[PDB]
From Swiss-Prot:
RRM domain span: 16-90
Oligomer status and interactors: Consists of two polypeptides of p32 and p33. Identified in the spliceosome C complex. Component of a ribonucleoprotein complex containing mRNAs and RNA-binding proteins including DDX5, HNRNPH2 and SRSF1 as well as splicing regulator ARVCF. In vitro, self-associates and binds SRSF2, SNRNP70 and U2AF1 but not U2AF2. Binds SREK1/SFRS12. Interacts with SAFB/SAFB1. Interacts with PSIP1/LEDGF. Interacts with RSRC1 (via Arg/Ser-rich domain). Interacts with ZRSR2/U2AF1-RS2. Interacts with CCDC55 (via C-terminus).
Coiled-coil intervals, chain numbering: none
Sites of Phosphoserine modification: S28, S94, S96, S100, S102
Protein purpose: Plays a role in preventing exon skipping, ensuring the accuracy of splicing and regulating alternative splicing. Interacts with other spliceosomal components, via the RS domains, to form a bridge between the 5'- and 3'-splice site binding components, U1 snRNP and U2AF. Can stimulate binding of U1 snRNP to a 5'-splice site-containing pre-mRNA. Binds to purine-rich RNA sequences, either the octamer, 5'-RGAAGAAC-3' (r=A or G) or the decamers, AGGACAGAGC/AGGACGAAGC. Binds preferentially to the 5'-CGAGGCG-3' motif in vitro.
Family under the similarity heading: Belongs to the splicing factor SR family.
Residues of the full protein shown: 113 to 207 of 248
PTM-bearing positions, type N6-acetyllysine: K74
Tissue specificity field: Expressed in inner ear.
Localisation per UniProt entry: Cytoplasm; Nucleus speckle
Gene source species: Mus musculus
This protein's name: Serine/arginine-rich splicing factor 1
């Protein structure tokens, strides 16, 4: 247990939700989801008016794959506008660790 904080978003008990960034001002969920399909099948789609979005792949397989192949690619909206978007597995970013006290024994 590397500590944790809750009390806001419902995100819990899940494990197939990725975050989308770099979305165009005309890009809509309806379209965004059409781009995540490449991975497999979409279960949930939603975009915000901040160039960001979120997709939930019914099969974790499609998720891990999307973040590999469908990550940092040029996404095109139904309007014909293109824009590079980034995809990643929702959750804690960057690895965690610590010690508090310097560790340096004699022998190895």
């Amino acid at each position: 247990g590397s500590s944790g904080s809750s009390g806001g978003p419902p995100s819990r008990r899940s494990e197939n939700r990725v975050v989308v960034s770099g979305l165009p001002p005309s890009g809509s969920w309806q379209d965004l989801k059409d781009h995540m399909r490449e991975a497999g099948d979409v279960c949930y789609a939603d975009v915000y008016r901040d160039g960001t979005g979120v997709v939930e792949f019914v099969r974790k397989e499609d998720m891990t794959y999307a973040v590999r192949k469908l990550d940092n690619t040029k996404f095109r909206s139904h309007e014909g506008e293109t824009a590079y978007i980034r995809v990643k597995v929702d959750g804690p970013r960057s690895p965690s660790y610590g010690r508090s006290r310097s560790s340096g024994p004699s022998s190895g």
